[PDB]
Symmetry: D2
Subunit: 338 residues, 4 copies
């Protein structure tokens, strides 16, 4: 029967994950039964229903009272405690925690859910220290059922890794540089304010803001042959969702743009179906809102020089497309549960 | 003889105040000697110098070490403690604390700076409970030197009150409604997230966000005859700075637009000089960045119906113009200490 | 028996109207058979389908060739001529032209479609000179079948008029002031550039831009008792769609907020059903995208002072909601042809 | 004595060029004596003074009447005719026309100023057909005084070329890929509307909008050895000014990031002084508003992989920094006038 899931942190990814699940609920081995977050159920039900990015939730009615959120008559219990050791995970029979607060990404932090009584934790971010990292359609079939804490990597990693995997197998990637032009996120400031990163301190909707990203090194964890071969940066720009990666590879087998495109297109129809989408259309970021693929290759931006320098460009919905992946990873753990 | 000032909360208002003071430093009875804020001096020196709104600070070099910010060789001591009772105000000889955190606006909260040793507190926001409230050019000459905690009201109140005072004296305001179309502030969320106010919870740069404001009631505290006669709302919109108030008054003496304009123009040249500016130009918000006035009356938007229903519209730089007024209030307290 | 419609100007309103019609196509007495626009059918089919505001059109497939757009197998003929006298309206048997270019709003301009052979014109904007003006749910039942050129007013007028009509009938409006805080439109510039209006010349997504509006005077054309009693302004702000009107009325019968709210709620359930929606929710602009009502009253912002000064605030999707009303006006003309 | 200049097209670049000149007026061999534009002098004086990006012009008073704009008592004559053959260039003794309309970039278009009586034209954009192209600090000393029509290339080309020139000379560029994350410009639409380019048709302040750029191929015109070796794209994003280029080169001489940085820094102090600025600061786009350099290298984003794959990142103020270059090219033509 059902794997009982709790969401810790009812943020952009927490609530996108909940909306993904509510739309895939008839096929699922998961049942979302609890939420912990720093605010109350009435606030959270309001935000779950009224989303500036996704619009008004249509499929089912959403209400709340002092201790539950109700979404189509399914009652989701709510609690509010910043310290996960205190959570009622044993009492609610929680099997799997979706860890989406952004502050419990190390094994020591995420373990406190295990102390509270949960059996497994899926971190919706890169892990700190050695937490196994999975990207669906790249390495998720290597999942080991005895693992109690996993990571679903970052949005950028989920866009980049499948593309790198297709190219590496067809051409042999020797080295690779990435830049993601990425929507701002809640980690940045609305107006100039203190932050650990002096660039992220700056008014996010007024600026182009460079920042580091672990996505390119993290690709080497999910494609171990490429460990150390990729590097990259991010530019945060004044859009609220939808991001784009630009990837430039030095490859071994000499090629041209038409063949790079053909190889990706062929993978998008077969081995990476549902993960990579191949687009020949002349679209912009708003058109990819709500797209279910991890990466949408923009085929007419592909270019190659001298045989060996290859550039591809791919879109991703960093909230929604990532949340669909978290749900897929979760369903996969549910189907291989021990 | 210099009044020693500490800034508590080195945010948009705290740092705007500091820049205002650094530019008026030769005339001043204040000396900023300390800052308390939740982050460190290097971060704060970087933010003081590199401002998305004001630009790069030009006049003087700004550096920092582990415990000071240096702004043109003037050393400003820094500490970092969330609880103001712990602050070293007696040890630094602090006379006046500029309370700019947004979280110590009641008397009980602001009094903790007095417990820590400061002699007076100027809150950069409306006071909760009865804290005397001053708007420079409206009632600051009623300031009483024995008051230990005061409020400089909100940016919106500083824009609205002087205009109300001029109109009330010329025409007799019986009732009035305000809407401010206001730049977003740090109090709102960048992307939809939890907040006390369900509207402020929503992505600030993507939405028009209505929200309540006490600015219209607060005008009744600084013009006591109008207590209970005014009300209003705010609309937060996707600009980072510069705001506009739209005020509709029911007045006693019948009038027309040209006369309403003339009365405010006259006050802008005499009693409200430096507080109200009168503009006949067709300008937009970005042209008011850095403006020193509390209100800039946009004269061609003035309209009157039926003699008695009067609408005026006025701009304000909610960060800079307000901070100039905090500095003026502070210099006034300094002069009457 | 179908009324054959051509769209002149396939802009934001033209394409919103087309999408509105494609979704209400089974109930309709209209058939859209032609489009004239300054660009070509492939470009226009791409823009019809891929909309930054409405999203990707889902219901039906949309394709194009050199001379038609196809939307669910329905073929819409396309031509491209700036001068409406040259248009092939007799050759296409056009009954009704939806005039959405923004440049043929006088009778002389709109009459050129009649010269070209159309039998009637519905202008998607206020008329210049005396063109009969209709607001659905306020005066559309006064439409006279012999009129050959009509106006559906502006988005702001469609939001304001129904609320004014309800309030006037319950309390007696003596005078009223409006400000609309309005999304930018294609009429403004992306970056500072030449324009007839020096304010609209300025970068629209960086500024609050005041501008005049005839919406408040135009309410007097559709509620003739209020002619000359209303005035207002607009503030354009950096959102791409969804607008809000703030209306302050001086009324004859003394009242309070709860009663003003109740009267509008009651009208929203009966006489203004589908035209005014009454909302008690704490929502922001992006939540009103796609709303079908002409006005959405935001009930908790309602305030009253002194019995007689009443403020209400109402939302409108200026592209979609307005286009639903153009379609309703058109269906009404169709039913009375 | 003075070269008499007219500005055709009083747009973002036309008015930025005018403000650059008003601030460098005491040193100059140019005198701006006329403007042609599609609107009137009162509108244009208003826009010259009140700028959403540059702020209120401070140095001098600016007024207008029916036929002049006055800027500090200097009277600039104004006319308004879309067709440059009709312009009064002989009657005003115009030597040099700054062609900033964006619509007269071919030799046939720009020549009509010569028919009207001007002696030379400087196009503030890439030329169409063979118009000599100059980038100050890369090839402007090759200027030939007998040329009657020239191009000052694009903003992106002025940022990229000097950097490519420094790298090519130190490491030998074999191939190179560029992406510019670029502020929107007046060429894009405010809300979705018809455009020759289906991506630029889309609401510029709401979208990330890919688009082609000739900047990378144009580098091969100013550095002829690299002709055919560079390619690239642009992403337009919702900021109104300030842009960033990300350049990834395959080089011949193996290197590391510290040495790439050192070479650029050394050029910024010597041969490219005033053209390339080397920044070690953690800044964002708004901080580079008004910067006079063509390219500001963001040194801590530099990275190298495998010796031969080099990535650098540089900022530019696409309006102001480009306009300073146009003024420099003009002053250079003035000092070598025939
Ligand atoms: N584009 C994206 O937004 C994106 C994509 C992929 C991964 N991620 C990652 O997902 C995680 C969450 O990101 P987000 O964008 O939802 O941020 P967010 O700030 O919207 O969500 C964080 C939520 O957790 C709550 N929270 C914080 N501390 C808590 C605690 N101690 N206990 C309970 N709740 C707490 C916050 O109030 C908020 O509701 C981060 O790790 C982020 O790196 C984000
Ligand atoms: N337009 C405006 O921004 C504006 C105008 C007028 C008045 N105000 C008022 O000024 C005050 C601050 O506004 P802001 O816009 O500067 O906010 P902000 O968040 O930018 O500034 C608050 C600063 O204080 C710090 N802080 C928070 N808690 C603290 C504590 N316990 N101890 C020390 N520092 C702490 C924050 O880290 C930040 O540096 C508020 O009362 C606000 O309502 C703001
Ligand atoms: N919020 C709104 O957008 C809104 C709301 C209500 C009413 N309106 C009114 O609707 C009308 C159009 O507004 P819009 O926002 O759709 O503008 P828009 O610029 O998007 O649309 C105008 C369309 O007509 C085309 N056009 C221009 N001249 C033409 C000609 N001579 N012949 C054929 N086509 C021509 C343009 O190329 C464009 O496709 C205006 O009268 C406007 O005031 C707009
Ligand atoms: N970032 C930038 O803005 C940038 C940087 C480098 C180069 N450029 C290039 O500079 C040129 C102008 O760009 P811009 O951003 O100033 O655009 P813009 O639209 O602001 O300026 C064009 C000006 O010329 C006017 N105009 C158009 N046709 C005309 C005609 N036939 N006669 C007279 N005036 C006419 C327009 O009204 C406008 O004032 C373009 O060629 C552009 O590619 C732009």
């Amino acid at each position: 029967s059902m794997v009982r899931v709790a969401i810790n942190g009812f943020g952009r990814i927490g609530r996108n994950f909940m909306r993904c699940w509510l739309q895939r609920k008839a096929n699922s081995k998961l049942e979302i039964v609890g939420i912990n977050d720093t605010s109350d159920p009435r606030t959270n039900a309001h935000l779950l229903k009224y989303d500036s990015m996704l619009g008004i939730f249509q499929d089912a009615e959403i209400t709340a009272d002092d201790d539950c959120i109700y979404a189509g008559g399914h009652a989701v219990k709510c609690v509010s405690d910043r310290n996960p050791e205190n959570l009622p995970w044993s009492a609610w029979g929680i099997d799997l925690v979706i860890e989406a607060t952004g502050v419990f990404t190390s094994r020591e932090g995420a373990s406190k859910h295990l102390s509270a009584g949960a059996k497994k934790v899926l971190i919706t971010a890169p892990g700190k220290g050695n937490i196994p990292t999975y990207v669906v359609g790249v390495n998720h079939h290597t999942y080991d059922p005895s693992e109690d804490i996993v990571s679903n990597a970052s949005c950028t990693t989920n866009c980049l890794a499948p593309i790198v995997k297709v190219l590496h197998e067809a051409f042999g990637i020797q080295q690779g540089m990435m830049t993601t032009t990425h929507s701002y996120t809640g980690d940045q400031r609305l107006l100039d304010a203190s932050h650990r990163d002096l660039r992220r301190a700056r008014a996010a909707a007024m600026n182009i803001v460079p920042t580091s990203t672990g996505a390119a090194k993290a690709v080497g964890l999910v494609i171990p042959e490429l460990q150390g071969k990729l590097n990259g940066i991010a530019l945060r720009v004044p859009t609220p969702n939808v991001s784009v990666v630009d990837f430039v590879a030095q490859v071994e087998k000499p090629t041209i743009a038409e063949q790079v495109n053909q190889v990706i297109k062929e993978a998008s129809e077969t081995t990476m179906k549902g993960i990579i989408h191949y687009s020949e259309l002349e679209l912009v970021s708003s058109d990819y809102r709500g797209h279910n693929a991890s990466s949408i290759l923009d085929a007419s931006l592909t270019m190659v020089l001298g045989g060996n320098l290859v550039k591809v460009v791919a879109w991703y919905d960093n909230e929604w497309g990532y949340s669909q992946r978290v749900l897929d990873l979760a369903e996969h753990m549910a189907a291989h549960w021990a």
